[PDB]
Amino acid sequence: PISKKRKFINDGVFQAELNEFLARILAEDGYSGVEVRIRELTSLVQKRFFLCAMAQAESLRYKLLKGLAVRRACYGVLRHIMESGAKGCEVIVSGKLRAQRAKSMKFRDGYLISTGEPSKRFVNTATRSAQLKQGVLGIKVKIMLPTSILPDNISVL
Amino acid sequence: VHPKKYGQGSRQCRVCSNKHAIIRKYNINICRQCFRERADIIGFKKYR
Amino acid sequence: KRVQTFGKKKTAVAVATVTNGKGLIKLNGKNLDLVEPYILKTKVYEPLWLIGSGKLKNLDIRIRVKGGGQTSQIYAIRQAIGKGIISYYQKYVDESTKKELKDVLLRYDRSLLVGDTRRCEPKKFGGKGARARYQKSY
Amino acid sequence: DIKLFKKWSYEEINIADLSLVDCIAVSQKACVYTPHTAGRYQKKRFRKALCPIVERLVNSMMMHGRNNGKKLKAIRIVAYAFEIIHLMTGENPLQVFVNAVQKGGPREDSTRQAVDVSPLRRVNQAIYLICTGARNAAFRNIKSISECLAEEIINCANESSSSYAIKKKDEIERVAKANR
Amino acid sequence: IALTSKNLRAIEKVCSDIMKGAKEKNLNVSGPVRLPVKTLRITTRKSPCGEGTNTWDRFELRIYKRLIDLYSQCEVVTQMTSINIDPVVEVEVIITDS
Amino acid sequence: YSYIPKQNKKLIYEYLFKEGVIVVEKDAKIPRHPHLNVPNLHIMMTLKSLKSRNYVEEKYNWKHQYFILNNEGIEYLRE
Amino acid sequence: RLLEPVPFVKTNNCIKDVDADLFIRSYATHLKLHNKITYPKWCTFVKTGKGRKLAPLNEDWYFIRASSILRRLYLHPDIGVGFLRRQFSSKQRRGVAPNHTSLASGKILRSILQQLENLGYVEQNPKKKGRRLTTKGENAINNFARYINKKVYN
Amino acid sequence: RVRTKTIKRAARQIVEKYYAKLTLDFQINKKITEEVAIIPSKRMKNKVAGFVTHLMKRIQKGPVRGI
Amino acid sequence: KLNHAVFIVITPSAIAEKYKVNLSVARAVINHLADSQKLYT
RNA sequence: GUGAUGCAUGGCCGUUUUUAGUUCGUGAAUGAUUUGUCUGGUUAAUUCCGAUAACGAACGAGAUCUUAACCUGCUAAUUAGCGGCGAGUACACUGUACUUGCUGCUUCUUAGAGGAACAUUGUGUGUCUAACACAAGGAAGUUUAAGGCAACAACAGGUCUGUGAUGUCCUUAGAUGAACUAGGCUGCACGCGUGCUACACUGAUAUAUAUAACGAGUAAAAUAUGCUUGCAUACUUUUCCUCCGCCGAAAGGCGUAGGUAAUCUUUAUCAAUAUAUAUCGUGAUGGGGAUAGAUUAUUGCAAUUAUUAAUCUUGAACGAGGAAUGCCUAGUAAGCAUGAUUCAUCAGAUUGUGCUGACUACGUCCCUGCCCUUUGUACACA
C-alpha cells in the first residue's frame, strides 16, 4: 500500500539489482532474456524478494584476462563487430600495460558519433575492468547500430 | 552496543556500506558516489 | 445568448461569459472597482471608451478572475472581454459593427487583442543568480 | 484623455533644443497614469529612449545602499515630488521637469581630447546627476528627500547654483578649457 | 480503470487497446481522463572527490496517468487487458453503472 | 562466550539442504532472518567456514552473498 | 476622492460590492457606538504578532482585527485558526540571521472567534468545517452593506 | 548564421529529380520538399526548403550552378 | 537638529517652508484652518 | 584495514576547453615534415562562398528535446469545470454574492498527438555568391529565447579515505576490526574568501485587500496481566504532512477529519518587496543591531560548549566607505523572499522557483587571456 511514486524508485532499484546480478554472473554466453541454470536464479531471486555490443564487450574481457596479446585481441574484435554488422567501432585499453607508466591507445573505424541526443540514442558503449598482475586495465568499447533514421540521412530517388 | 532507530547510523548506503553522502530522496537509500553511475539504469534521465 | 471566453496573458488567466441582460458585469463578487489599482482600472476602462458604454448597456459579461499577478489579471481580462464581445458580435448581435470594432481596438494597439509571451526562465547553475557567479578569489 | 496621476496631460511642452525631444519621448503611446509599466528595453536602441522620462527617473533615483530595489516607493516619491514642484512654483511640474532635463546635461566631456555628448547620454547624465544630487541632499541635510527634490529640480531648471548637477556640469565642461 | 507508466508510448499503445473492445462490444463506457504528467527530478554533484570545479547534474522522470471507466464485466475486462498489457505498465480496475 | 549450539548448527544444516540456495547477508545485527527463526550472527561464520572448505561457493555482491551449493556439498554436511 | 464614475450595471446586493478597509472602519465606528463587545482587558499586554516586535499603538488594534476577521469570514465560509494565522503572517528579523516570514499569535484570533461566537454573528458546523455566517448574520451584514453603500452614494 | 554543407548538398540533390513538379509557390515548394525527401527532423524539413526556395529565386535571372 | 515649533495655500510643504515647522504640526495647522498624503482640492 | 604509495594503477571528475579544433585514403612536394586543413569575403564555428596540387572522406561544430507560446471549436473530463434548474437567504422589477444536487456541454483547469518559424513577404547592403538591413503579418524573426551532450592530445591535476576497483609495500590480540565513555575540527593576535545584519525618511512603524510556481509529504507507541516505577507475555498502529476544535503570550501540548496523494496541508490560493491612510518626519534618532543574565517548551538517552526557541534588559561599529579586488546585458543584475537537499534538532551552505520588472552598449582590443598568419630564436624541462 505504498505510493506509486515511491514504487517507481523501488522497481528501478530492483531492476538495477537484477542488472548487476546478471552482469556479475553472465560470462559464459550472451543474453537470452529475463524472466518475469534457470532454476538456480529463479529460486535465488524469488527467495531474495520473499551481434551484440555488450556481448563483444564481455568477449574483450574474456580475451584479455588470460594473457593473450592486447593488440591482436583488439584487432580480432574489430573484425568481429564489422563481420557481425557494426557500422563502426572503437576500443580503448588503458592502464599499466607492461610499463610503469599508464598508456592508452585507440582503434577506431567508422563515424563514432560522440555528441547529442541522437548520438546517445544510436551509439552503444560499454566499459569493463580487468584485474592483472601489476594493476588493472580499463576497457572501453563502442559499437554503432546502423540506421529509425539518422537526422543527417538524406536521399531522394 | 548503543543502537537506536535514529540519526545517521540507523541507515547507510546499500553498496559502499558507508554513512557519508547518503541520499534518501524518495527513500532511494544510496550514496551519491555509486548513485552517479547507477543513475541511467535506474531511470534518472539527465535531461535539462 | 451565452458565450464563454478566456484570456491568457502572463500568470493570470481570466474567464468571462457574455450573457443576455442589461450590462451586469461582475468580477468574482467584486466589481471592476475594488481590485485596488485605479491605474489599471482605467487601463481596463480604455476599451469602454473605445467602444462605448451604450453597447455594454445591453449585454451582461460575468467574470471570474483567479490567481496570478495584479498586472496579469487586468491584461488577461481585457483580452477575455474583447474575445467575448467579438464572439457575441459574430454570433448574435451584429457583424458590420464588429468589423469596425476589431479596427478600433487594433488602432489603439495590438496588445489588447493578443498579449505577450514573455516569461521567466530556469535559473542557471553557478550562484544565487541565473546568470551571476559566486565571487572568485585568487 | 489620459491624466498623469489624475492631474496632468502635458498638452504643452517647451521647444528645448528639439533634439532631446526624441530622447524624452513624450507622446500618447508613452502616456500613462503612473510609471512602472511593463516597458521593455532589451531589443534595440530606441525603446530605451521611447520609455517616458518620468519612468526614467522612477527607475533611476532608486539606488542607495539598502534603499536599492524599492520602486513602488519611487513612484510614491515622484508622485509627491510633482505635487511640490507645481505648488512651490507656478509652472507645470512636467514642464519645469523637461526644462531641468534639457539644461541639466553636459554639453561635452573629454573622457579620453574633448568630445560632444549624444542626446542619449545628455539625458542620461542629467538624470544621473540630479538623482545623485538627491541622494546627498537626502543624506545629512535635515530636510527630507521630497523637499530636496523640490529644491534641486528648480535649482537645475532655473540655473541656480544650489543644484549639484549644474556644479558637476561646470566641472565636466571645465576639462575642455584645459584639453580642447 | 487507471494506468500507470513512465514512457508515454507504452500508455499510448495500451490506451489505444482500450476503446476498440468497447466499440466492438457496444458497452456503456465512460470517457477518458488526461491528467497532467508528474516530473520527478533530483540534483547530484559530479566529481567523486572534492577537487576541481563543483559541477552537478539534474535528472528527470516523466510519469503518466490516465483513468477510464466501463460498465462491462470485471472478469472479461481483466482478461482483455491482461492479454495485451505490458508488465512495465500498471492497471487498476473499477466499474460504473450508468 | 557466544557458544554456538549443536542443535542450532543442525537446524541451519537442514535449512539449506531443504532448498539448495541461500542468502545470508553480511550484516549480522538483524534480530531475525526472513525464513529462519534463528539468530543470524551464528550462521555466516559457519557458512564462510564451509566456503573455505571448497564445498559451497559465493559469487558475492553488495550487501548480499548469494551462495551456491555444489554437487559435492550434500554429502559432507549430511552427517 | 475614493469614488469613481460607474457606467456599468451594479447589484449592491451584498457587502463584497462595497469597499473593504473603509467598510471595516465604518463597522468599527458602529462598533464603538453600540459596543456589544469588550476591548478586551487581556489584549493590551501581548503584541499582535511574534515578528511585529512592536506594540500596536492604536487603542483599536483589537477593534479593527475583529472587523478584518469578520470580512475574512464573509469572503471565506470555511476558515480556521491556521487560516487566520497565515492571513496575519508577518516578517520577523532575527538580528544577525536573515528575516523570515512567520505567522501571527493564535490566542488573539481564538479569543476574537470566541467573542464572535458569543455575539452569534457566526457559528460552527461539521459540514463546511470552517466558520459559516448565520442567516441572521447574512441579513444584518447585508443591511449594513446597503446602509454603507447609500451613506456614501448619497 | 550561415548554412551548413549538409543542408546545402541535401538542397542540391533535390530539384534535379522532379523540377517539372517544383513550381513558383513558396508554400508548394516547401510541401513538396518533405513530400519527396526523407529527413526526420522537421526543423531541417523546412530549413533546407528555405534554401531550395533561395536557389530557385536565382533562376530566370542567370546561371544557378547546376540542374 | 530640530528647532521648529508649532507656535507662530494650506499646502503642507508650502506652509512648512513659510513657517519653519515640523510636518506633524504642519498637518496640525492644516487641520486647524480647514476644520499617506492626499491629493489636493 | 579510512595504514603508506594518486610519482605504481582503473574509473570518474577538473582543467587546457564551449573555443574550433583533430585525423585519414590516394595524389603531389634525402629527411624531420608539407599540402589537403588556404590569399580573401562571411559567420557562433576550417560555418560556408571562392580561389586552388589537390581530390574525397571521418570526428568536433552543426543538431534533438524539455520550459513559454497559437491552433488542431481534434481527443476527451478525473481529483477541473461550464451550465441548467431544484429551493432559496437579501436586492432589482415587465439577473446578482451565499448556498444543495445531478446531468445538455469540454476552448476554458489539462495533455496524447502534431502543426505552426521556414531570411517569411516585399523595400536594401553584399563579388549579386556566402552573408547581412528595414518594414510588416504573426504569440513566435538575436537559430523564438534559456537548459545537455564535448572530438584529438595532454596534466606525471584530485581521489587507492567510495567501493569486495586495484598492484606493491605495511599491520592484527598490547589490531591498523568492531563497540562503548569522554573529548575535536564551534578553541583565536590575526589574514583571505562565500556569505549573514546597518548606516534610514528613496525611510523607522500599524492595519489589509490583489497575490503565483517548482514544490514535499505515512522494525515502534501505549494499554492489561504476572513478578516487585522496572522486566516478561498478549491486543489497534503512533513512528509524514498535517486541517480542525481546544489549552498555553509564545514556544509548544491535547484529541480527532483527510490523504501512499491535480483529492488532505492546498491552491477560488502559501512568502516578501506591497497597498491607502494612519504614529514619526534624518534630531548616533525612536534608525540599526555587534552584546548580555534571567528562562520557558520542543528535538535526541544525553543541549555543559548558553543546539533550537518565546519575552525583558543590551546599544559596538555605521555619515556610503585605504591600497586592492569580484560578478554581471533580459522578466536577467539587484532587492526581496521561498521551495528542495544534507534532516531526530539546527542555513548564516548548496541546488531550484517566483514578485518588483533598474542606469547604458546593434560596440573595442587599452588591460588580461585565448585563436590564426608572417617573422626571429642560441628555447624543446619548451
Short mmCIF file of C-alpha atoms (C1' of nucleotides) in Angstrom, two decimals, chain B residues 1-8 10-11 15-16 18-20 22-27 31-37 46-48, chain J residues 2 12-13 65-67 146-149 162-164 179-181 215-217 219-220 300-302 340-346:
data_model
loop_
_atom_site.label_atom_id
_atom_site.label_comp_id
_atom_site.label_asym_id
_atom_site.label_seq_id
_atom_site.Cartn_x
_atom_site.Cartn_y
_atom_site.Cartn_z
CA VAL B 1 26.39 -1.53 21.81
CA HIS B 2 24.35 1.70 21.75
CA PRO B 3 21.88 1.13 18.90
CA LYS B 4 18.80 3.19 18.13
CA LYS B 5 16.49 3.85 15.18
CA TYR B 6 17.66 7.45 14.84
CA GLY B 7 20.47 9.52 13.37
CA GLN B 8 22.99 8.87 10.62
CA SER B 10 20.48 3.61 11.59
CA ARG B 11 20.87 3.82 7.80
CA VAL B 15 26.54 -0.81 -1.79
CA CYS B 16 29.52 1.09 -0.38
CA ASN B 18 29.21 3.91 4.36
CA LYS B 19 27.31 6.69 6.09
CA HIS B 20 28.84 9.58 4.13
CA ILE B 22 23.84 9.21 1.55
CA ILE B 23 20.77 10.47 -0.30
CA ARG B 24 17.29 9.34 0.78
CA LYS B 25 15.32 11.31 -1.82
CA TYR B 26 12.22 9.21 -2.39
CA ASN B 27 13.80 6.77 0.10
CA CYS B 31 25.20 7.30 -1.76
CA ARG B 32 25.90 9.99 -4.34
CA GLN B 33 29.09 8.16 -5.33
CA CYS B 34 27.62 4.86 -6.51
CA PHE B 35 24.36 6.55 -7.47
CA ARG B 36 26.00 8.76 -10.09
CA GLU B 37 26.85 5.64 -12.12
CA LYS B 46 19.81 13.52 -17.29
CA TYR B 47 17.74 15.87 -19.42
CA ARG B 48 17.95 19.59 -18.59
"C1'" U J 2 39.64 5.47 6.20
"C1'" C J 12 35.17 9.18 -12.54
"C1'" C J 13 35.84 14.29 -12.36
"C1'" C J 65 14.35 17.51 -26.98
"C1'" U J 66 12.02 19.99 -22.29
"C1'" U J 67 10.22 25.27 -20.38
"C1'" A J 146 17.11 29.54 -21.82
"C1'" G J 147 18.81 24.47 -20.28
"C1'" G J 148 22.74 18.87 -22.06
"C1'" C J 149 25.58 16.06 -24.68
"C1'" G J 162 33.91 5.25 -2.48
"C1'" U J 163 33.50 0.76 -3.30
"C1'" G J 164 34.78 -6.90 -2.03
"C1'" A J 179 31.65 -1.49 20.09
"C1'" C J 180 31.36 1.68 24.34
"C1'" U J 181 32.83 6.64 28.00
"C1'" G J 215 7.40 22.34 -4.54
"C1'" A J 216 7.20 17.89 -0.27
"C1'" G J 217 4.72 14.55 2.13
"C1'" A J 219 11.10 -2.98 12.82
"C1'" A J 220 7.77 1.39 17.07
"C1'" G J 300 17.55 13.40 20.69
"C1'" C J 301 19.01 8.73 26.29
"C1'" A J 302 22.22 12.69 26.88
"C1'" A J 340 14.18 21.28 -2.15
"C1'" U J 341 18.92 18.62 -0.33
"C1'" U J 342 22.09 17.33 3.73
"C1'" C J 343 17.45 16.24 8.46
"C1'" A J 344 15.64 13.40 15.05
"C1'" U J 345 17.35 19.30 16.06
"C1'" C J 346 19.99 23.08 13.62
#
